[PDB]
Each structure stands twice: as structure tokens, then as C-alpha cells.
């Protein structure tokens, strides 16, 4: 019947603007499944939407229940659901239109729900969807690396590699047999080395502010997860046809993309929008199961204290992924 959740009913609230509320448990449609949530993961998008930065596209209507990355147990399925039964443990991606993550229950489409193996925890799994698939898409599509053994070997730069997409990106890039150069805060330099990065740079230094690799590497692709960097700084560090992949693209990135396209610049800036596909989520889940990829969890917060997790996300000093559990 009813359900604990967190809502914002207005732009600009910050964590203060979140409200604990009791709300009717959603009902699954033909193709949806209903989950008792075991873990929910935050993404920077989630608090940006609330700040109003994604207007006029999101949020669709107030009030909003935030977060899309989710793991839990199937409680109930819709008439059309073929592949999941009640009791099944899953990981899923909620619609970016309706949100729903910060709650006891959520409905997910079957096409974005994946069975979660016994080996993989709920928090470990819930951290995967947006961050992991983004990292995966960037390295698979624009960077053009296979992740078996048949991919192009290459030089990869990962900016802000201590964060959500960042720390997945480094691990994945290593599985594609790439040389990985990474940037992060001084504190996280040892951590990023442990993800498999070949070179790690303190971004406040001179070689890291300029993104110059000690081997003198030029990068074939950049999984760009940081924010304050103009194409100027990337350019001299790029290979002849290097692509900087902005996984959090603003108007600046969008414009640069247009200009570099229309002037046929050999060096390119690629805005990335994630297209979550269940095959990829299944894939990432397997990588975690097989130990080829580890999820690092910055912190775990109870839904009753979810604003803390929200504020931690807003500060964005998180290392890996922030998790909210019941």
C-alpha cells in the first residue's frame, strides 16, 4: 500500500530540499517488474536535475523521487513479463523520466532488468548501471576498443578517475589492453594505481594540469569525467586522430563538437549520451562476478538518512559510488 521515499517538489533545494514522505507502492505495467529495493546508487545527474541544470528536459513533473541505479528482489511482475519471477534478485535501471530510486520499492522495465548472481552483492551491482555502462559505452563505441583480445591496442587518458564513471573506466580500459594514464586528487593517487592505471597524475600539479604523460604518451582517446578543462589543454596531448569523450557534456562541449565537426578537425570532441542496453548491464555484472572488475563503494547510507548521501554526491568528493540501502 504505502512506502517510504524521498522527494523534492522544487528546484534548487539541495539536500535540504529533499523530503521524507510516505507514498503509494508503485504498480508494474504490462512489461514492468516491481522491486523491493536492497541498494540504490546515486549519480551526479540526480542532483543536477534538482538544481535545474537539466531544464527544460528534466524533471518531467514535481514531485520527483531521485535516482535510477537500483538493485533488489522482484516482488511482482506485470502480465507481459517472461523472464523474471517473484523472489528473483536483480539489478536494474529505472526510467530517467520517472526516477524512483530513493524508495523501498520501484518499478523497472523488463528490458532494463538483469538477474543478479549470488556472487555479486546488491550494493556492488547497484553501482554498475549508469557509471559502468557509460564507461563501457565510451570505451566500446567512440574509442573503438574491444574488451576481448581483438580490439585496437591504444593510449587512454581517464580524467577524474577516482570517481563513479572514472574508476570503472580505468578498469575496463585495462581489460582492452590499453595503456592508461589517469588524473585524480593527490589523496586518491594510490587508489587509482590500484585500479590498474599505468600512470597517475595529481591534477593540481604541472604535468597533470597540462595532462602531459611522463612516458610522453599521446592519447588516442580520453574518457573525460572531470569538468573544468577546455579543448586547448587536451589538444597537444592527443594523438593525430585522438578523440576526447566528454561523458558529462555541456553547451561548451556541444559547441566544440559542432565546430570540430564542421571544420573537419582530425582531433575530435565527442559528447556522450548513454544508451543503457540490458546486454551491456548483463556483461558488466559478469565482469564483477568474475572479479575482472571491482565496484568500489564510497559510502553506505540508510534511506532514513539519505540526504547525507545526497549532500556527499553534491560535494562530489566521492571515491567510487555512493550507495543508499534500506
Author numbering: 4 to 329
Question: Could you pull the original sentences from the published paper?
Answer:
In the crystals of the binary and ternary complexes ceQORH-13-KOTE and ceQORH-NADP+-13-KOTE, the asymmetric unit contains 12 and 8 ceQORH molecules, respectively. The quality of the electron density map for 13-KOTE differs depending on the monomers in the binary and ternary complexes, suggesting flexibility of the 13-KOTE aliphatic chain. The 13-KOTE binding site is large and solvent accessible. Upon 13-KOTE binding, the loop from Leu97 to Gly103 moves, thus stabilizing the ligand. In the complexes ceQORH-13-KOTE and ceQORH-NADP+-13-KOTE complexes, residues of three ceQORH monomers interact with 13-KOTE by hydrogen bonds and van der Waals interactions. The 13-KOTE carboxylate group from one monomer is hydrogen bonded to the Arg58 guanidinium group and Tyr14 hydroxyl group from another monomer. Thus, the 13-KOTE carboxylate group is an anchoring point allowing for oligomerization in the crystals. When the apo-ceQORH structure is compared either to the ceQORH-13-KOTE or ceQORH-NADP+-13-KOTE structure, the main chain from Asn46 to Leu61 and from Ile250 to Lys269, containing the α-helix Pro254-Met267 involved in the dimer interface, are shifted. 13-KOTE is not a substrate of ceQORH though it displays an unsaturated double bond in α,β of a carbonyl group. The tetramers observed in the crystals do not have any physiological significance.
The chloroplast envelope Quinone Oxidoreductase Homolog (ceQORH; At4g13010; molecular weight 34,034 Da) from Arabidopsis thaliana is associated to the inner membrane of the chloroplast envelope where it represents 1–2% of the crude envelope proteins. Despite its original annotation as a “QOR,” ceQORH is inactive on quinones but preferentially reduces γ-ketols in the presence of NADPH. γ-ketols are long-chain reactive electrophile oxylipins and are potentially toxic. The ceQORH monomer is formed of two domains with (i) the catalytic domain including residues from Gly3 to Pro132 and from Leu277 to Pro329 and (ii) the cofactor binding domain (Val133 to Leu276) showing the classical motif of Rossmann fold. In the ceQORH structure, the internal chloroplast targeting sequence is folded as a two anti-parallel β-strands (Thr71 to Gly81 and Asp91 to Leu97) connected by a long loop (Ser82 to Gly90).
